[PDB]
Design a protein around this ligand. Sequence first.
Ligand code: CL
Ligand code: CL
Ligand code: MN
Ligand code: NA
Lengths: 255, 256, 261, 262
Amino acid sequence: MDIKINDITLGNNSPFVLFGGICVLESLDSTLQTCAHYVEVTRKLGIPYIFKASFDKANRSSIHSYRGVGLEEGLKIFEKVKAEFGIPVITDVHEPHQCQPVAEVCDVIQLPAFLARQTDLVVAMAKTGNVVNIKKPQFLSPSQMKNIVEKFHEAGNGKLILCERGSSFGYDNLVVDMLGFGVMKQTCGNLPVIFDVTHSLQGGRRAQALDLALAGMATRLAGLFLESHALPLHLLEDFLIRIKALDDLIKSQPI
Amino acid sequence: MDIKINDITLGNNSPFVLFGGICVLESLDSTLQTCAHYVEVTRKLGIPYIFKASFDKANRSSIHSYRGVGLEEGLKIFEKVKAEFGIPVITDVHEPHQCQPVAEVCDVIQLPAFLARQTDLVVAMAKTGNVVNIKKPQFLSPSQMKNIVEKFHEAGNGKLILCERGSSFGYDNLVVDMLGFGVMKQTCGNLPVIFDVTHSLRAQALDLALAGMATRLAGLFLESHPALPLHLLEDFLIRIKALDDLIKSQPILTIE
Amino acid sequence: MDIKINDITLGNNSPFVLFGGICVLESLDSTLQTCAHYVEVTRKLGIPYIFKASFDKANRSSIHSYRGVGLEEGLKIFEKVKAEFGIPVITDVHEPHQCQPVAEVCDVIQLPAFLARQTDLVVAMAKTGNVVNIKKPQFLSPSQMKNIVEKFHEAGNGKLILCERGSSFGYDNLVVDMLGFGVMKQTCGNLPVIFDVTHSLQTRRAQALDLALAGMATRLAGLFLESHPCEGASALPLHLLEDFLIRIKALDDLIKSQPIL
Amino acid sequence: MDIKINDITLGNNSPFVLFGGICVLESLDSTLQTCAHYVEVTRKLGIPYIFKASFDKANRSSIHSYRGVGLEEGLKIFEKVKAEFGIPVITDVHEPHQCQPVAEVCDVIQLPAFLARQTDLVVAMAKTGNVVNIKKPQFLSPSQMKNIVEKFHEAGNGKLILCERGSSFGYDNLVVDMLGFGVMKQTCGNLPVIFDVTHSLQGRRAQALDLALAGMATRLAGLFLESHPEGASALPLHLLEDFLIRIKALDDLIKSQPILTI
Ligand SMILES: [Cl-]
Ligand SMILES: [Cl-]
Ligand SMILES: [Mn+2]
Ligand code: NA
């Protein structure tokens, strides 16, 4: 099953979509500069693109640290981004009350991985009717995603993206099971599956991210989810050139 | 470090405290009957006892399974339990706004494992000044508990309990690392450590509980249904008490 | 199922047996000294005792690592241990041809964790007729132990001990699943189950008593451990053995005094 | 570092080599029949191929499963395979004493995962001077492989292949860490790394394909892969050409691009 996001077709047998932005929003001008960079590179390589950012840093280093511009001033910035660049955007929500006002502005709303079993937040996200990205818990088996999908469906929303972010592997480590992509497709009605390479991790780091991105996208996925300021930006170009080459080849092979 | 909960002393070198009850408050009369049975058995054996229930169960099996009686009626039921039996009670909170009204009624307030790194909720819990039970997420290592305790300390509350509930082990399975208890004791200032055997998992329950309490713990945390069958409570606790009394009666032995 | 080893009754509802000793045989005189300590401490505490050591470390990280005194020498040392103290002994075997020679002397022969799938080794062990200690591989689940037991049974030897030594947990770490003990009891005909606390601690050392108590709380035939007066650093300081075992016996006596079910 | 195996160049920047065949040798007739299938499919696509079988398998699933025809007849069968098809072969050895006579015939000798730390076998294998395939145990981290490599180097042999077969993930299940390939390359001197997709899985065909493609996307010297019409199930043969067409497409694309810039 494909999902239309404005002008974009997102699906497991479409050209891959890049989801990319920043960690948490800070300022209007800083958010435009970075989005401008993603847009320039993606445009000239011919890759569809959705801008990602959080208005809130829910888990903070200190009880005293910067948190982000918050919801009220977060949304303002998203509205600009969309006006200036005419692309879709994606952000995470944590409280049920937040869900409808955020869906007003943000094309895709994201269910955080820690919160995926919180039935309140599931129902409230569903009721927006917006496109939803479900982050797979690092503790959850791929064949259990069907149970989250069922809850969304019972609540009346079928516009769901499943998002891989790694599985717990001993203490303080993650491994990505490349077999899980297929299990989610097979058990969840071939909804779009995307791969969050950035959170699945943690010059090698740069190199490591490329290997892992290529491996995931070899399994035939709707999109790649990532971040940068942790990946540089002349590298962004070099990285995507290689991802698009592989994606194009894979998607040209009959299933 | 010990913590006083009314007339109970909770600590890793004290007689174990049972945190026992049911999953979610659904009723008044049945809650009281179940609590009455815990009270009778624990009084008979001289085991300190705290009644547990949730008033608001997130993470239910279906979107319309009953979430429980909710905040206002839940606190009223907790008040009746406290008035009838004279025991402390424990419940969980899910939002900052719930922290004040729950803490006014409940002797212990619990940070759900899935929310354990949510700073706003940690700060709001800390600021109640209440005793807090921190549930260890299955995906979190035992040496990372100190980061949660530091956040509470920064916000001015040191009356903290650490609660083991198992660790993710491959897909859809849990293992309890018995070495984790000591790591928590040693890195977190010897705060009280308790063991949630119910959520870690029924001869199995008994083996797992005995194994845990053998490592010298402040408390044991479990749920029954009228979850261990309620009528087998006395037999279960007699065996746990036997082991706890033995272990606690010997001075700690240090290995290099 | 109980197993008689000379005068010792080994079983999951009998008083725990200590399988105790050292990483590797280094000489006769060091061996005799350490064994003497084990024997005098266990005798006074009333704990049945089997002496343990390897004659070869067959899988160290250098081809010039120290490997111990080797087979022919090692068996001579086991011979003297048995004559002097009158106790049973246990050692591991790494190659099929070793089995019958080693079994003529060593009462219990041990299948190494890495080698459990080695069919020729299983068969050669089984044929000796000796009591066998099966190390549960770090990569094998407790409900598949039955598969190794089935092979020994098909090869005609039913005197088998199941030895827990930890489970792989991510990279380079182990965890001990306290529920595995009961799984092994239920699926392998209540054969004696024992706990190797030393190797379970590999990656801790300060935590050996807590881990050993936790395992014995589940009601076990035996405890398996190494001391030092060869390693990942988890051996018990030898002088601490008496105080260590006082605690283990206290718990075992309690658990074993409670009816089961 | 590349390894020359007769006419074949094996290395992580070279076209991928297929390793595959049968579980155990039974007879010359049976072996030639199976080998011919692989040879014909790989010749049709221009993929270098190395035939695998055991002459005496020590880790089968029951104690009376057939272990193979044995050393003496096994080596005669390997000799004929080599003569008939002009390809290299590979076999596992589990006894030190068997290393020398096997190495007279078999181009690659394979160290079983369960014996990967056994010093006496490692030394006896090294001293043959043959190319060696080191099977990585499911309990070993990728950064431990260096230790095995060092033991071979100490004993005089650096013609080593590292073979990934998955890692223990909770109970029973194996997972393949796609980051492990890079860790082995970086720590072990860019020795050839190959991927045993079949074991890694302890229908089954669609799975095998995704996992194989993901591994080869990381830039690898070869693929280890069982096919025909035990402990680990093989890919059905009518699928072999179509499977290999897809692996070769990805491999050619990847190998044709330079490793990233500084
Ligand atoms: Cl709870
Ligand atoms: Cl068999
Ligand atoms: Mn040792
Ligand atoms: Na209170």
